[PDB]
Design a protein around this nucleic acid. Structure first.
Ligand SMILES: Nc1ncnc2c1ncn2[C@@H]1O[C@H](COP(=O)(O)OP(=O)(O)NP(=O)(O)O)[C@@H](O)[C@H]1O
Ligand SMILES: Nc1ncnc2c1ncn2[C@@H]1O[C@H](COP(=O)(O)OP(=O)(O)NP(=O)(O)O)[C@@H](O)[C@H]1O
Ligand SMILES: [Zn+2]
Ligand SMILES: [Zn+2]
Ligand SMILES: [Zn+2]
Ligand SMILES: [Zn+2]
Lengths: 798, 798
DNA sequence: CTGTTACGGCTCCATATGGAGCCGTAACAG
DNA sequence: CTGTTACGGCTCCATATGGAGCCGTAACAG
């Protein structure tokens, strides 16, 4: 009844020995980068998944790929592990919310059993859109055909074919020797048409033939190369047909192809995804599509109030009970505004995670260890009780939860807390304390216990800043479920936008404000939202978005060169006596130009070795021993250390080393302020997590010279941060605001909210019922509003 | 604590409602085809696997494919399911027995920790052959390079290039327009060589250039087609190089490629799979390869008797304990003769299943339902106690076993028995009885209880046949572990070959006797085994092997046309008054020739419909409604039924219908005798299981006119058969022997053994210790031998 | 010195024909 | 009538080039 883990060496773990109780609610807590998330996901989930995959069929194991074993001695008493974290994918159009939650099948069963028609017999398999019997013939069950408009094909019909008329990738005729150019020349020769005449003056038949091919006509096409020539017979498919075939054959490429394609609803079924005859069967005056289009809460209400005869109740008791239970679970999780007809692709991370949690609750799996990553993220404070009750119900049926959460309310409901610390990175990785909440609070050495007992807390400000007369106004915001509202955001103050889950705040910000600001100032190409007008553009210089996206897709970028301190370091290295004597330059001491980098590894530092029946394995270079530089570059020294030693130095040690140089001390102090004192100046960007990337971006913004006309947009920066990290982030944001800029943060944590300078609340509910503005102004003014959940919470906090 | 299954409609299940207790030893029993195996595998395992896969990552779900949901209402309380059945795959050479059993890692740990050298430091990752650090450089860790001998390239060097010198597929120059022929012509033009001169007279340099390519040389190659011509520049890779690339890029193709390739051991490491320096570290005077080459039992004995100092025992207590426990589990399963260096590819179904069972025992997963398919198959009677103890130990750590077994000893050890009957196919599919063994025995209606109580039993024969002087002698059998023995097999009597597991009987039969008989009489091309001579070939006409291999890979073959009764049925249909009036022919009434089959479905009867983002779905044809015939053919009738009704008729109903025609009555009675009275004459071969195919083959052999010079070879025909099926098979085999033929059966069940006419025993143990002959003669004579396990068992049986 | 803009260089990720087996049929021998 | 052999017909499974983003560097203005 214990999951004994002995000898854990993954990442930065200091060979800990932890005994986690089984079939209980266990929460693992630690600072950002302390190693708790690593200890959970990379050790326990990986071991369980590897064991179950190996126990399964070999072909399925090869299909799922090869999973490396964890660097752990042995683990005793492990059950199969299911990981529920914030992830999303395009998946397929065949998948919707209803079929993911396994409720559409029960709806089909109910319709086939007790539904009445208004001809083949009614069958449960008929109502499904995945079978040819019930699928709409025109839209083949998708319900929305995909096509590319001719307008998007050529951005400028006046321009000629070679002038840049092919905006789509893979078909441009810019290259003379390109296959597309050869095909275009062959088509022009066959049609006796000249490239000089643009599409505007060309006959429509010629353009149609070019776009949709020759419709099976076979013509002789001659190809040329540097030293090869010949002729072959083939039929041109067309640019649109080839693009459609390429899209159907196969993420980035899919997005690029869909950028030029505008989906439209099927006209035969109007998006019902079913045959016209299949919708004849109706229950209570409503067909299947109408029920699927209803929101979860009102659908549950309609099913509860549904009346039926004795025979109907006898024949459909089980289906009705199961549907009611599943809808109750869906409501209890917190998604009472979703519609069963909504495509699963257009779902946020939190909504998808909650949907998966509800599906796992409804499935009824027993004896499975569950690993969760902050279920409370992206969820309002008022739903914490519902989420905790749902988690307790899920655990009670014979499961255990290894929830990695830092919320204060979660700590008071768990049965076992494991704390990792004391610091982060190399400083942490040890089990400082563990036990129930009382023992953690009594423990003085525990980092979480100090914040829980109240020894350290975020003090509310006593004086709040006021607007200086510069305002930004949004008029006619009608995107998604917004009910044509007008919002005023003051400039020069810390602005926080709150609201009930799914109220439309995230849409209103991302799809409208950031996109319009980028298109108006950054000179980008992004489709804006559905808004009337925006006033206050002239008050801004540029807009910067901070997110947890990776800062680099290549191992040639590290924080030292991203922040910009690398150039200053190289200047000092090249301005030494030895470099001047040898006639070196500041560009020599960098692993991105020929002359200084190691020749064997081409400056990457990692060599590639391939095996006969194994994926390529990366090995450290032997010539340079992974130092990324040759002997000549490493010969020079500066105060006892060479370039490799500086690159392999932590932030605090670098600050201690460069105390005499202010132009670098400033940048290193900026990096240290955001709490990145444990990383080194040579860590590859591909190994940087989301929090590290966000902190690096914040440090970069801090280092810049503020002009007082910069707008920062943040989308829940407190995703994956402890209380101390929250305090540090609040301090950094206040410093940024005091610098002379304005910050807009979509935050749900009460600690950040209570220290804001201007609060905009969107409600009063979620889904179509919300989209309005309830309260505005300072938090003190908002707390006085009776009909506002955020106001009541702020009244309790303050 | 119950796995409640309600409304099961898979295959032939009659909507059963079963409540299986949790965390217990449950055995599901039934006749061959009754539906027990379906009810287990297709319902419970499928539902559990689908639930766990859907609970996992979406990309992994797509990688593993789409699994159709079972036709079941709902299942309550299901844990993840792992299926352990007789399956095998080529896998990869990187996988051996040791790494599958997860013991090689512990051996590496022990060698790195306490092993002593005789240079970089010793590291656990160095000893592995999957990393470049310790892998042999020449053989890249495989230990046996793969190459194709030049002799196998051309079967006849005297013949010219176009005379059939390219025996390998994909490179023949028979087709004038083939790419291979064009490449050969281009090479001949470049080398100024003629095709008339064969390889015997051609210079060796030209042959080497042809085989291994031009070694990067670029030449102009001209290609021609029906109406296309041109030239291109390319470098010839060579036939051998292209074949190697094709093999490396990617089962049937792999086997075909390996047929022309003779694997040889690596000369640098002599198959040690490691660098010469890595084998320097030795423990107790033995390196890693020597330990891996030892058998399991002697390796366990060596580890048990190993002595170490106090510090060594303190530092390697856990590794030694785990290795000893794993080797003890391996011995207890029954595989005490295997070597850890043996490749996993060359393993039988039973050995692989037992290895997987031992690995699952060692892993120690908890809260997982285990489904097993006759673990006792391919195992001697003396190891049943060990296997049962192993299964009980596996269950005791918090698991349940849904073992589908029919062995008598298993019934007396289980905690719950579920019986399906009464018959098979449409006749069965109902839960006749369930409970403990006592209640099953007391139940009169239970099919298994009647055999268990002793009401029905296989009576031992009182008079046994004797050899007639015709004998078959094998001289110098040295294949595999056979110790150059000579065996005498009498002809005209029922011969059964027994022995301890892994004694070499299966090798001695399959790799030598059947292959030589086929090559000498059937005029086949199969490499025989390592034997000196065989005497008695002139006494035989042909040899027939009966196995559970599928009889057809296409839906155009059914038992009606395989047995040959279809031609006789069509003759009577064409010999009616209506057919004569219409001028029809006997070939019209068949779905394999144009004229009678449905035009829309081309006689297959199933139409194909493809979706945009879904795999192609098969749908019954709408024009013919799946009758596979047009209206004109179905118009004719014979005694009130048409051809479709005859095809859709069961065996017993067909026997009742055709009582007046003896030439069809004989064949239908033959089919009914082997117990296939529940199938229909229109079932596709692709849907036929192994037992059905074996019974169809037996019926086909029975139908043939016996000439008294036929040899039948069977390899465990009782794999997946109940006691009644065993009795029927024994009766059929006795009928075959009485017909005038000789049957050789490698059987382990005592019921078949006790009714044999001649018993050949191989022992006295398995592995290298066995391979000899212990006892020979009638079972009564064998039972008197004291030093024979089979004789000891037959003493109690008789 | 310090910030900005523009240009050049570099890297990772993306997009139809032959062979084995079975069925039907003609011819022949018992 | 019936078994055997040989031939023809049919079917399923198998085998290199452009674009987005980051880094280094020259030029210019405060
Ligand atoms: N692609 C879409 N198509 C249609 N409606 C959408 C789409 N995306 C969002 N919506 C609607 O817009 C509402 C608000 O979405 P959004 O603003 O992203 O929510 P949110 O406040 O971030 N919710 P949460 O994740 O709980 O924090 C949703 O409740 C939907 O009703
Ligand atoms: N490919 C192989 N290479 C080397 N040795 C082999 C190979 N196959 C089998 N052997 C050896 O031959 C012995 C007998 O094999 P085999 O005759 O197939 O056993 P079996 O009687 O069928 N055993 P079982 O499966 O337990 O019923 C094995 O124990 C091995 O030692
Ligand atoms: Zn439609
Ligand atoms: Zn190097
Ligand atoms: Zn070697
Ligand atoms: Zn048809």
């Amino acid at each position: 009844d214990y999951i004994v883990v002995k000898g854990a060496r993954e990442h930065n773990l200091k060979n800990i020995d932890v005994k986690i109780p089984r079939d209980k609610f266990v929460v693992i807590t630690g600072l950002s980068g302390s190693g708790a998330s690593s200890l959970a996901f990379d050790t326990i989930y990986a071991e369980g998944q590897r064991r179950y995959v190996e126990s399964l069929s070999s072909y399925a194991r090869q299909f799922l790929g090869q999973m490396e074993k964890p660097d752990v001695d042995y683990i005793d008493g492990l059950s199969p592990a299911i990981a529920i974290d914030q992830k999303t994918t395009s998946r397929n159009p065949r998948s919707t919310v209803g079929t993911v939650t396994e409720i559409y099948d029960y709806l089909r069963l109910l319709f086939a059993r007790i539904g009445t028609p208004h001809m083949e017999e009614i069958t449960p398999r008929m109502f499904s859109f995945n079978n040819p019997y019930g699928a709409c013939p025109e839209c083949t069950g998708l319900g929305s055909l995909m096509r590319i408009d001719p307008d998007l094909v050529i951005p400028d019909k006046k321009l000629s074919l070679a002038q840049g008329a092919v905006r789509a990738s893979g078909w441009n005729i810019a290259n003379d020797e390109s296959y597309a150019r050869m095909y275009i020349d062959a088509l022009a020769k066959h049609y006796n048409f000249s490239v000089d005449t643009p599409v505007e003056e060309l006959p429509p038949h010629i353009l149609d033939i070019i776009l949709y091919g020759t419709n099976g006509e076979k013509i002789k096409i001659e190809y040329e190369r540097e030293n090869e020539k010949g002729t072959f017979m083939a039929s041109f498919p067309g640019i649109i047909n080839s693009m459609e075939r390429r899209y159907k054959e196969t993420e980035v490429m899919k997005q690029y192809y869909e950028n030029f394609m505008s989906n439209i609803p099927c006209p035969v079924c109007k998006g019902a995804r079913l045959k016209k005859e299949s919708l004849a069967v109706t229950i209570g005056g409503k067909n299947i599509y109408e029920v699927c289009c209803l929101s979860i809460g009102e659908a549950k209400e309609f099913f509860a109030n549904l009346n039926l005869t004795e025979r109907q109740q006898l024949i459909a008791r089980q289906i009705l009970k199961e549907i009611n239970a599943r809808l109750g679970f869906l409501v209890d999780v917190g998604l009472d505004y979703l519609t069963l007809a909504r495509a699963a692709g257009t779902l946020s991370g939190g909504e998808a995670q909650r949907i998966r949690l509800a599906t796992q609750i409804g499935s009824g799996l027993m004896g499975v260890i569950y690993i969760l990553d902050e279920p409370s993220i992206g969820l309002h404070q008022r739903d914490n009780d519902r989420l905790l009750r749902s988690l307790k119900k899920l655990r009670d049926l014979g499961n255990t939860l290894l929830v990695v959460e830092h919320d204060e309310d979660t700590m008071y409901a768990s049965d076992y807390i494991i704390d990792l610390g004391p610091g982060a990175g190399s400083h942490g990785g040890q089990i400082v304390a563990e036990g129930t909440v009382e023992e953690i609070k009594q423990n003085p050495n525990s980092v979480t216990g100090e914040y829980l007992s109240g020894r350290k807390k975020i003090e509310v400000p006593k004086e709040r800043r006021k607007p200086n007369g510069k305002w930004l106004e949004i008029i006619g915001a009608r995107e998604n479920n917004l009910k044509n509202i007008n919002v005023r955001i003051p400039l020069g103050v810390f602005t926080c936008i709150t609201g009930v889950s799914g109220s439309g705040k995230s849409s209103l910000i991302n799809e409208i404000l950031y996109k319009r600001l980028a298109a108006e100032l950054n000179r980008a190409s992004v489709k804006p939202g559905e808004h009337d007008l925006i006033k206050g553009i002239e008050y801004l210089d540029k807009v910067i978005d901070i997110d947890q996206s990776p800062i680099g897709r290549t191992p040639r970028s590290n924080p030292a060169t991203y922040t910009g301190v690398f150039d200053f370091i190289r200047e000092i290295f090249a301005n030494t006596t030895e470099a001047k004597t040898r006639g070196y330059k500041a560009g020599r001491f960098s692993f991105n130009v020929k002359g200084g980098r190691c020749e064997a590894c081409a400056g990457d530092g990692i060599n590639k070795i391939e095996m006969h029946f194994l994926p390529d394995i990366y090995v450290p270079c032997e010539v340079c021993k992974g130092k990324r530089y040759n002997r000549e570059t490493l010969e020079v020294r500066y105060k006892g250390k060479n370039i490799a030693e500086v690159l392999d130095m932590t932030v605090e040690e670098a600050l201690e080393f460069f105390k005499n140089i202010p132009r670098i001390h400033k940048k290193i102090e900026t990096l240290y302020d955001v709490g990145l004192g444990y990383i080194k100046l040579g860590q590859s960007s591909t190994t940087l997590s989301g929090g590290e990337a966000q902190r690096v971006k914040l440090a970069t913004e801090l280092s810049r010279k503020s002009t007082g006309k910069t707008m920062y947009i943040l989308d829940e920066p407190t995703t994956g941060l402890h209380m101390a990290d929250v305090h540090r982030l609040v301090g950094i944001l206040h410093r940024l605001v005091e610098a002379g800029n304005s910050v807009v943060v979509i935050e749900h944590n009460l600690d950040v909210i209570k220290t804001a300078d201007y609060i905009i609340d969107l409600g009063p509910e979620g889904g179509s019922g919300g989209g309005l503005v309830v309260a505005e102004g300072t938090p003190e003014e908002v707390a006085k509003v009776e009909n506002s959940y955020t106001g009541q919470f702020l009244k309790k906090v303050l």
